[PDB]
Structure formats: structure tokens, C-alpha cells
Write a protein that binds this ligand. Structure first.
Ligand code: HEC
Ligand SMILES: [Cl-]
Ligand SMILES: [Cl-]
Ligand code: NI
Lengths: 11, 95
């Protein structure tokens, strides 16, 4: 369920 | 030359996915592998044209192949396609 961007898009 | 995908890099990626990301692999089997009632699944290998999964379901086990739309040139192509497929698959069950 967790969205991958929570750990793999650093902005 | 540019650095290619290799068997040793494939093995590093597969172990990191099986250790910490197992829920995502069961979603790949359901949405892209046409499987139902999946209890869990693991990545056996990844290669330039697809990945092989072991899928458990209803007390049994089987191996399946998921083919990619375009070939992978290196590990950055592999990283990108695994994240794109997970975003699409989360959308199926949450619409
Ligand atoms: C809660 C944080 C978190 C989330 C969310 C997350 N990851 Fe990861 N991911 C990590 C960590 C930590 C690593 C470093 C390797 C390891 O220990 O698993 C990593 C590594 C990776 C790698 C690189 C492995 C390598 O050997 O180069 C890929 C590909 C990956 N994750 C895919 C995904 C996908 C697909 C999703 C969404 C389904 C996802 N991640 C969501 C924490 C996360
Ligand atoms: Cl690493
Ligand atoms: Cl990593
Ligand atoms: Ni790492």
C-alpha cells in the first residue's frame, strides 16, 4: 500500500 | 562502454525487494501476472526483457514470467520500471 515516493522521491 | 545490467546486480536488487518490499511483489503477481488469491510472492530473477516470480496460492506454488514492454539497458531502467509498475498496481485496488 505505501506509496513508493515516500522514500524514493527526495524533494 | 556504458555499464550494463549483470547477474550480480540483478541478485542485489532481487534480495533488497524480497527482504523489505514483499507486499509489492504479491501486487505485481496479481495485476501484471493474472494471478488470483495470492498469499505471497518472491522475485527469483530480473533480466533485460522481464522478471521471474515464485507465487504461492491456495496451498500450492508455481513460477511465472512477467515480460517488460521495452528492454532494460542498465540498473537505472530496472529501478524505474519497478517503481512505475507499483504505482499503476496500487491504483487498481484503490479505485
Ligand atoms: C519506508 C521507506 C521505503 C518505501 C516506501 C519504499 N522503499 Fe524501496 N528501498 C527502501 C530502502 C531502505 C532501500 C535500500 C535497500 C534495502 O535495505 O532494502 C530501498 C531500495 C530500493 C530499490 C533499490 C535496490 C538496489 O539494490 O539498487 C528499489 C528498486 C526499491 N527500493 C523499490 C521500491 C518500490 C517499487 C517501492 C514502492 C512499492 C518502494 N521501494 C518503497 C525503502 C523504501
Ligand atoms: Cl547498495
Ligand atoms: Cl539499494
Ligand atoms: Ni543500497
Amino acid at each position: 500500500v505505501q506509496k513508493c515516493a515516500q522514500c524514493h522521491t527526495v524533494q | 562502454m556504458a555499464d550494463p545490467l549483470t547477474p550480480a546486480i540483478s541478485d542485489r536488487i532481487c534480495k533488497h525487494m524480497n527482504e523489505d518490499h514483499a507486499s509489492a511483489i504479491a501486487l505485481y503477481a496479481q495485476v501484471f501476472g493474472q494471478q488470483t488469491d495470492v498469499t505471497m510472492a518472491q522475485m527469483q530473477a530480473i533480466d533485460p526483457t522481464g522478471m521471474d516470480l515464485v507465487v504461492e496460492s491456495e496451498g500450492g506454488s508455481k513460477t511465472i514470467r512477467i515480460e517488460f514492454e521495452q528492454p532494460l539497458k542498465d540498473s537505472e531502467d530496472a529501478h524505474q520500471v519497478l517503481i512505475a509498475m507499483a504505482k499503476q498496481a496500487r491504483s487498481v485496488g484503490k479505485n
